[PDB]
Amino acid sequence: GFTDYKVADITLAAWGRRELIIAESEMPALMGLRRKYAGQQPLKGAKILGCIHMTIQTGVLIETLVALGAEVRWSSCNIFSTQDQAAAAIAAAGIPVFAWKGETEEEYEWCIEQTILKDGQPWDANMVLDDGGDLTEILHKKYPQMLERIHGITEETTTGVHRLLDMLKNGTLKVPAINVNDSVTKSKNDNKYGCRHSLNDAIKRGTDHLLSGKQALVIGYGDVGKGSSQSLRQEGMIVKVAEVDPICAMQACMDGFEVVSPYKNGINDGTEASIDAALLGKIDLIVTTTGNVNVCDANMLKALKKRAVVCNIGHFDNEIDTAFMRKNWAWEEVKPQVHKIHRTGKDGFDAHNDDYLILLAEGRLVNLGNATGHPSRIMDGSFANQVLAQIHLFEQKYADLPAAEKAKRLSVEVLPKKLDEEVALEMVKGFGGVVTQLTPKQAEYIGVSVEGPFKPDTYRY
Amino acid sequence: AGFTDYKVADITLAAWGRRELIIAESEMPALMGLRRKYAGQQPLKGAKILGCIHMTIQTGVLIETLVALGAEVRWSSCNIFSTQDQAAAAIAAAGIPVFAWKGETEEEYEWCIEQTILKDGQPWDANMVLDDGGDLTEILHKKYPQMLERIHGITEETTTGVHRLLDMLKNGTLKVPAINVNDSVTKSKNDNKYGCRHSLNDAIKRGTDHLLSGKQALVIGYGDVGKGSSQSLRQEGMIVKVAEVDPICAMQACMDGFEVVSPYKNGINDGTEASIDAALLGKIDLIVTTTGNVNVCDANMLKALKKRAVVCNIGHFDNEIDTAFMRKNWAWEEVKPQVHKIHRTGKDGFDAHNDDYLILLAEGRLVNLGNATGHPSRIMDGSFANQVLAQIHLFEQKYADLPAAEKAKRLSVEVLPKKLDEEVALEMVKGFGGVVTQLTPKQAEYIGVSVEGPFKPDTYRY
Amino acid sequence: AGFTDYKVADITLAAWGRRELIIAESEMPALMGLRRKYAGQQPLKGAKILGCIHMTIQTGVLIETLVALGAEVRWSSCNIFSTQDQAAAAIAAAGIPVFAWKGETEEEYEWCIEQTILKDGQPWDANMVLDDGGDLTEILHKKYPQMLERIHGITEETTTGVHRLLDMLKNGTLKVPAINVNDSVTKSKNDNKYGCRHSLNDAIKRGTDHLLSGKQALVIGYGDVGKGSSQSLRQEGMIVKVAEVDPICAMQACMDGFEVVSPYKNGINDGTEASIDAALLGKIDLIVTTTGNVNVCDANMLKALKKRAVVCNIGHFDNEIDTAFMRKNWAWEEVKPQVHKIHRTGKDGFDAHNDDYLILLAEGRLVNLGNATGHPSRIMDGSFANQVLAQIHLFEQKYADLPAAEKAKRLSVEVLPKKLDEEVALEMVKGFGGVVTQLTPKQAEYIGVSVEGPFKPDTYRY
Amino acid sequence: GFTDYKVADITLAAWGRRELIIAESEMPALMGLRRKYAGQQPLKGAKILGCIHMTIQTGVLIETLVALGAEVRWSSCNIFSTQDQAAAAIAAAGIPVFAWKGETEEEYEWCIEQTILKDGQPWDANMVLDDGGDLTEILHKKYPQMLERIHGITEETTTGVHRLLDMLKNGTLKVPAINVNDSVTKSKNDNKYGCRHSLNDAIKRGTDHLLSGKQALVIGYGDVGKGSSQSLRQEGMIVKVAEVDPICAMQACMDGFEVVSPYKNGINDGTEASIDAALLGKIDLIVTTTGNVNVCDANMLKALKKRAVVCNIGHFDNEIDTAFMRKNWAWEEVKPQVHKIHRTGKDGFDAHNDDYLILLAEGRLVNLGNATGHPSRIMDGSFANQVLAQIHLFEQKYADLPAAEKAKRLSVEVLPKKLDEEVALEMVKGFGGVVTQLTPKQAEYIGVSVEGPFKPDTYRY
Numbered sequence A, D: 001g002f003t004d005y006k007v008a009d010i011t012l013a014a015w016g017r018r019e020l021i022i023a024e025s026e027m028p029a030l031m032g033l034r035r036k037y038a039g040q041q042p043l044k045g046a047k048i049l050g051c052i053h054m055t056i057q058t059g060v061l062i063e064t065l066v067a068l069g070a071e072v073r074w075s076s077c078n079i080f081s082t083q084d085q086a087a088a089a090i091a092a093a094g095i096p097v098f099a100w101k102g103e104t105e106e107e108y109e110w111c112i113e114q115t116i117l118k119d120g121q122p123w124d125a126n127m128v129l130d131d132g133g134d135l136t137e138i139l140h141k142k143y144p145q146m147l148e149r150i151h152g153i154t155e156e157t158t159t160g161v162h163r164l165l166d167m168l169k170n171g172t173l174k175v176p177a178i179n180v181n182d183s184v185t186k187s188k189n190d191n192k193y194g195c196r197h198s199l200n201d202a203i204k205r206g207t208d209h210l211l212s213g214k215q216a217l218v219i220g221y222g223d224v225g226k227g228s229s230q231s232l233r234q235e236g237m238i239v240k241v242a243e244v245d246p247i248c249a250m251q252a253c254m255d256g257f258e259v260v261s262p263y264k265n266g267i268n269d270g271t272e273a274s275i276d277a278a279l280l281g282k283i284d285l286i287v288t289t290t291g292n293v294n295v296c297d298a299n300m301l302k303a304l305k306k307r308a309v310v311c312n313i314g315h316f317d318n319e320i321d322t323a324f325m326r327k328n329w330a331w332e333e334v335k336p337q338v339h340k341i342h343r344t345g346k347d348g349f350d351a352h353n354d355d356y357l358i359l360l361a362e363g364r365l366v367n368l369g370n371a372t373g374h375p376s377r378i379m380d381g382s383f384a385n386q387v388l389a390q391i392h393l394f395e396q397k398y399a400d401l402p403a404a405e406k407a408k409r410l411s412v413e414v415l416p417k418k419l420d421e422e423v424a425l426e427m428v429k430g431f432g433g434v435v436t437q438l439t440p441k442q443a444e445y446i447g448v449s450v451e452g453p454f455k456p457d458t459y460r461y
Numbered sequence B, C: 001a002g003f004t005d006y007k008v009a010d011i012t013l014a015a016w017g018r019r020e021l022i023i024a025e026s027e028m029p030a031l032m033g034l035r036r037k038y039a040g041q042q043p044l045k046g047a048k049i050l051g052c053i054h055m056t057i058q059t060g061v062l063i064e065t066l067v068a069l070g071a072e073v074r075w076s077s078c079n080i081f082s083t084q085d086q087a088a089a090a091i092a093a094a095g096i097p098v099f100a101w102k103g104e105t106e107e108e109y110e111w112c113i114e115q116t117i118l119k120d121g122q123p124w125d126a127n128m129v130l131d132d133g134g135d136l137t138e139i140l141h142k143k144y145p146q147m148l149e150r151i152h153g154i155t156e157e158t159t160t161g162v163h164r165l166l167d168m169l170k171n172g173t174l175k176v177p178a179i180n181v182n183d184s185v186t187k188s189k190n191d192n193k194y195g196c197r198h199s200l201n202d203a204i205k206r207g208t209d210h211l212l213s214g215k216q217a218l219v220i221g222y223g224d225v226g227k228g229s230s231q232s233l234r235q236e237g238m239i240v241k242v243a244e245v246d247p248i249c250a251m252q253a254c255m256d257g258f259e260v261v262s263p264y265k266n267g268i269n270d271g272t273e274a275s276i277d278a279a280l281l282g283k284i285d286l287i288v289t290t291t292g293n294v295n296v297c298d299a300n301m302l303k304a305l306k307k308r309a310v311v312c313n314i315g316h317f318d319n320e321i322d323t324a325f326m327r328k329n330w331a332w333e334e335v336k337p338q339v340h341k342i343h344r345t346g347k348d349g350f351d352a353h354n355d356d357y358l359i360l361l362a363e364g365r366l367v368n369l370g371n372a373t374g375h376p377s378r379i380m381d382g383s384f385a386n387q388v389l390a391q392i393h394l395f396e397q398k399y400a401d402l403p404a405a406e407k408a409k410r411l412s413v414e415v416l417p418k419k420l421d422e423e424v425a426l427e428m429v430k431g432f433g434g435v436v437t438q439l440t441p442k443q444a445e446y447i448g449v450s451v452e453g454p455f456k457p458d459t460y461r462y
């Protein structure tokens, strides 16, 4: 009589299991590790608190971790990102999961606490898998005693890594972490190509708007901005790119984009006078990709072309000043995760008003909120890295080391390039690709082993 | 007035070269901004720079920037086919020693480098080296080691040259420090990739005027050059397949929409004709090597290629293709300079209407420079702004003046700091009319950077 | 509310449908411009239109435009899977007879068309037909021929429908004139191509959430739908191969950068398993049929496809794929609505973990409408502005009231004049914020056109 | 002792022969016609006046006509389009050719005259092959008696067809014509993909400018403007498109381009005030593609960004107001067919002036002027049509008809679709493409023969 879960509808489990079986065939690197390490059971004794979007893809990751011996308790890291049939299949497998699509903020926090607490007391957790740092934060701030037993954190995404490095710099990080984001088979796969697949996917599902011929402004040109700009350009949008980093802006120019600023001469002085109103009045779609705060601000929202679509694909919703819009403008729900924001005022709207914006997923990550996030064959790389990272920190056994050895190992590290390459090779074979083997003379000529690693650690790909 | 200390193809091309320099200067804002920023300070006064890099119009703007900052130079090309003769002539007419022409022999190539090293029959009192590929660096270490005692540093342009510096550093044979100019992002991820995107299809059209759309290409390699090369051909409508030994680069090729294949069955190169994927190579209209490695388009691949396929190399050296095999066994018919039909029917003569030939560009030497003009000015702007900054830095550090114990602590291969890489990029972006946004103080604090940058940790890969 | 003359899935979706209609109106400036232009004149006053076309949000705006101009209508969908239930509910809640829901059986499909034809058990006094594929046209000619005595014209949306009309005209069996709406440039080269570009990869993602980049696709056909479908996949990074019987379309595929292949050895489809290029089909991850032809993805191709390939059809009718063979021999496993795994291990039951299956989308029916929402409003604007102009033209001509000799001269299948095609395009361009330049008198005289257009001869192909 | 020619340098003939031998391997449709018709000699007795760019590809066309039985006398239809090695190879084969790169207007007219006159008297020509209509006009106006002997004209390009249709309208056309341009294997191959290949080719050879990241304005979006826009966009330019035809403008929007006018509201009233100076002041490259007059006018040239490149790929050099620039601005030759135009005045220039434009090929066809025009494998389709059109008209012997039968036969027609498909099939085989054969049931289902034509004549591809 398994009841240790909370999902929208347990009766979706059979559907979710059908999609898990399909997803498994799309995830050869992750399923390869499941088959490789099953005999060793390297996560026997691991008790993992997991906080990451409860999608079908996350389901294959969860069941891999359990297949290698772990126990887990799971929650989503976003109120809109859960696929309810994925959550139901995991719960019907007997795995504690607290997640549904459309949580309130209070339900979101309740779901994390349900993973942390078992029977009203702290679970004897000893591993953390996090995506964005919310679970990491709650443990350090509200359950610090639990971190005495925890061997490490494996952190999925750019924003969570930044938070770990701030903690490390300030002396507040209590356990070591692996930066999963910066494996090449994560950052330069998931963050870029994942958003290429899923950004225009979510815009179409949300609005069914034609994108070809229309004007877009992408704020940011890091890995997510690069993939997002391509998602839109390959549909035929005229894409303009904003950046604060001149190296990233240089890449945008060379990639064929006009680089512009929302602010005259790029100077954001906080006044309406600084807004390039002519530019913003021609933009049909703005997408924020930065991991920064208030990059689509109130004065920008006032100046945007009527009926423009606004969305965010960075981790947190504060990229767009949705607070200003809740305070001043009237919200008309079109359907779940799609709202018309009427700039005519706060108290009610005319149903035929033409002066509105369309906001997707209330400013939360739009690929997961309005579609299904990245596809399985892309998440394969990210999640193979997660598994390898969990194995590595669980085996290092930090929670048991003497203090001097803790000092040497309290760090945020990445996986070695050899492993990054082994993940990539399984991905390539999933496409039917054939990697050539160096001859001994050729390996000697460029100074590498025939087996790799093939590049110095400085190499940027 | 009596300047004779040069050797070029035709000095009367100087006026033409000067017109093209004046145009190129307006395409190179980072480099020309360095010229303006530092001219009064003369930070290279006293520098005596041996330069070895493709004697193009773009290199001319680099040379005159070094001279305008106070340096003296003596120059040669780093490839027998890459000089633009009008550029070398303009530089010579300006009274600057340059020894370079398009279509040098190997003996003339080595003579030209030695003319930069020697002045009036004796070693020039050089104290700086600017190199592209490592040949000048090698000749100095092997043949003129005494000159290195006075040299403060090497600024090395390209991936292959950096590899050779790092081999010397690990072997204990590198005598002076170096800056790896290649690995600035405004070099590696500008020049190596987008430069080849611009100039590869350029050189193939100039050499052959072949339609590329609808035809099959095989690109060997998918590093920065292979990425840019693959894009050069795909954007023309070619059906491009990619080979790689690096699974991470192979993963990128898959995700970028290319089929990843090996010339060898199951990727295993046992040296026999039997290991060749004859069915694959029999379909390929164009093969491009981009690896920096040896014999990646080998004799058995060449025998298996589709009749009338084009063969070329855009890596730094011609040993990527087994051209020696083709010289030894097959008859060469010159179509026009840097374009040869190689007839696979035998060595002693050929039927003029023979159908079983390959077209080789630039005799397997770097094809974008041999058959066209290499990277365009606005891309080389980034590379050469980095070169000027690197020259300034190593010259000001004065390594050659240190005691032996301190030289040992300073001997290293380094990259320029990120802040400079960003400053080059900013001038490039302004040259496109791009407008970079400035962080507010709260935004800078939120992501943990200074408002002025650097904006990324040194681990960032872009 | 008193009004019961409809049948939809759920009338309570009406308000949601109305919200989407108000958005779609802002995406359809040509259609809303016609509403405002002709509202006062009521040119369709007295028209009674039988309509049979995908009951989507876009069709809703079309319906309410005909009504706003004076017409009465009775509506059904031309496909069992293409209805958007909230669009049908909005139309029914506006008082408009509509019989349509997503997921009809075949018997229910036929019944819905008959409910538009009949009002209270007797033929409605229809006088106009709007059709998409020819099913309603066929039912009237076969089963209700008396009704055609009062009907002034048919306006036919799509290529397959027009083919059927032209065969009836040749055979002397077409009883009323038609307008070929499909062959307006703002329909054929807008809807058929760019609509499939937008909506094909859209439906595949919704149905399977598969990564497309780096995978192998085979598009059967390279007409307008095959062009837009091939681009839909290639822009995602698929490696796309194209099959054609028309060498001119195959030439376009080559120049567009696709490899042109046949599923049969040497292109010869003799019906044997030996004729199948099994090596080619064993590498294909996705096959899309775009032909309007029969059995272009046949039993032997289905047998030979790579395990776990996706199979779909974006032509009008589901017989492009041999789904009947799959129904007879293989076990179907529903993943979710309009997504089935087809287990090639046999008919009775399946292993839930079997690896040898295909994924079929929308049971072989038009996949963009079955698994997503079809073309976007801004593209359908062009098709449906043409539909409204075509309805106005044939209604005002009053074919059914003309003397016999006048009928004989007007019994034809025609396209709208090019001047109207241009006026639709102009509104579409303005909807993008584009600005069309006006010729000077001298420039107009020089190319031999009016400043107002038409700008091209009728022979022009764009 | 053959002397009946004039070329730049006859010693270039061996080079030209080498490139002809290579080009033949790139032109399977044209070489296929040599084999299919050699035995029958369909052009035995044809005497063809030919006027078209004397390129390597034209050399293969010429020698195909001769191999099928024709005699010819040849000139180029543009002063800059000749490849001198090609003209030399043709002269050395004993074929009268009068053409070199860099003719004056006087030499251009003289070269056409030498094809018309053999030994000071009109040659007994009975066939005409033209590209642009200059030879056709000269014969109608200056030697009308020779048209009593001529069976027809086969006209290569859109501008030339327009000029023929003016005469058919006015009743002043003396012989029938084949509109070769409007074969699909010409118009939608040569005019579009040909310019795709050769526009960015000529711009690189002429300027070596980076195109990625820069702003282009393409005037026109017919077949040449479509291919031109793609030539630039695929290099990473940000391309804007002007059109007067709203259908063509619709296609540009859908193809992912911003459609703009050089003039406010699109109204070309001839004033400086009409110019959108903000737009023109951002454009790095303008390309005219219209076949119309003065579509890049004096006020657009005055407003263009400093150092922008200006070129024309339409047939005639009056698309750009070069006359205005010759009268008012100082011209500095960079190298052959590349000039800087200094907007500081006419009385000389400062060698370091920054306020100049770069004009390519003096406003003449830039792909042939600064590069080599379309590649062999594209020109294969166009020229296979030219050969079939010459046979199609020669075998009909219009000049032998009585006046009443001539009237009935007098027309400007395209080749039937069956020939168009025959050319396309040979093109497809040259790529190694495999066309599928319809089954009888399938052919019956769509109402075509298994042997084609597969499309009604109304079809637009």
Ligand SMILES: NC(=O)c1ccc[n+]([C@@H]2O[C@H](COP(=O)([O-])OP(=O)(O)OC[C@H]3O[C@@H](n4cnc5c(N)ncnc54)[C@H](O)[C@@H]3O)[C@@H](O)[C@H]2O)c1
Residues within 6 Å of the ligand: A157, A158, A159, A160, A190, A191, A194, A195, A219, A220, A221, A222, A223, A224, A225, A242, A243, A244, A245, A248, A289, A290, A291, A292, A295, A313, A314, A315, A316, A365, A366, A367, A368, A373, A374, B437, B439, B443, B455
């Ligand atoms: N939705 C998804 O599936 C998904 C996937 C991966 C990562 N992410 C999230 O997306 C965000 C970005 O990730 P990334 O890996 O691209 O990071 P990144 O560091 O590579 O890129 C962020 C970029 O934003 C730029 N930027 C910062 N402030 C800006 C401003 N005011 N205006 C313009 N540009 C500005 C920076 O210069 C930087 O290049 C993070 O929150 C990350 O966690 C989301």
Ligand SMILES: NC(=O)c1ccc[n+]([C@@H]2O[C@H](COP(=O)([O-])OP(=O)(O)OC[C@H]3O[C@@H](n4cnc5c(N)ncnc54)[C@H](O)[C@@H]3O)[C@@H](O)[C@H]2O)c1
Residues within 6 Å of the ligand: A436, A438, A442, A454, B158, B159, B160, B161, B191, B192, B195, B196, B220, B221, B222, B223, B224, B225, B226, B243, B244, B245, B246, B249, B290, B291, B292, B293, B296, B314, B315, B316, B317, B366, B367, B368, B369, B374, B375
């Ligand atoms: N022509 C130019 O203008 C130009 C510009 C920049 C660099 N280069 C030269 O091009 C070469 C490549 O430079 P890069 O920056 O791209 O280096 P890189 O290290 O980024 O890429 C080289 C790639 O070749 C691959 N490779 C090695 N052996 C291989 C084999 N046998 N088969 C397939 N792939 C193989 C490696 O895995 C690697 O990814 C160097 O010689 C460099 O100096 C030329």
Ligand SMILES: NC(=O)c1ccc[n+]([C@@H]2O[C@H](COP(=O)([O-])OP(=O)(O)OC[C@H]3O[C@@H](n4cnc5c(N)ncnc54)[C@H](O)[C@@H]3O)[C@@H](O)[C@H]2O)c1
Residues within 6 Å of the ligand: C158, C159, C160, C161, C191, C192, C195, C196, C220, C221, C222, C223, C224, C225, C226, C243, C244, C245, C246, C249, C290, C291, C292, C293, C296, C314, C315, C316, C317, C366, C367, C368, C369, C374, C375, D436, D438, D442, D454
């Ligand atoms: N789903 C949609 O939204 C949508 C939109 C428009 C049209 N359609 C339908 O799509 C179909 C195609 O329409 P179209 O306008 O592209 O027609 P089309 O005539 O332009 O093209 C169909 C192509 O199929 C090719 N073909 C025929 N049999 C073939 C075979 N056995 N193998 C390979 N190629 C073959 C033909 O040569 C032709 O070029 C029609 O049924 C039409 O009604 C669907």
Ligand SMILES: NC(=O)c1ccc[n+]([C@@H]2O[C@H](COP(=O)([O-])OP(=O)(O)OC[C@H]3O[C@@H](n4cnc5c(N)ncnc54)[C@H](O)[C@@H]3O)[C@@H](O)[C@H]2O)c1
Residues within 6 Å of the ligand: C437, C439, C443, C455, D157, D158, D159, D160, D190, D191, D194, D195, D219, D220, D221, D222, D223, D224, D225, D242, D243, D244, D245, D248, D289, D290, D291, D292, D295, D313, D314, D315, D316, D365, D366, D367, D368, D373, D374
């Ligand atoms: N250089 C080459 O190799 C080459 C090849 C083929 C044709 N051409 C020539 O190029 C020209 C164009 O040929 P095409 O086949 O594209 O003809 P086209 O009729 O298909 O296109 C010309 C286009 O220009 C547009 N146009 C006319 N006046 C305009 C104006 N003032 N502003 C903007 N747009 C305007 C028209 O609407 C039309 O769409 C003709 O002179 C033709 O002979 C050149």
Ligand SMILES: NCCc1ccc(S(=O)(=O)F)cc1
Residues within 6 Å of the ligand: B029, B030, B031, B032, B033, B034, B037, B385, B389, B420, B422, B423, B424, B425, B427
């Ligand atoms: N006007 C800015 C002057 C300037 C010009 C160039 C640079 S650099 O990036 O190429 F070192 C830096 C500063």
Ligand SMILES: NCCc1ccc(S(=O)(=O)F)cc1
Residues within 6 Å of the ligand: C029, C030, C031, C032, C033, C034, C037, C385, C389, C420, C422, C423, C424, C425, C427
């Ligand atoms: N210009 C607004 C009036 C108008 C609105 C629509 C059209 S139509 O081409 O779409 F029938 C024509 C004219």
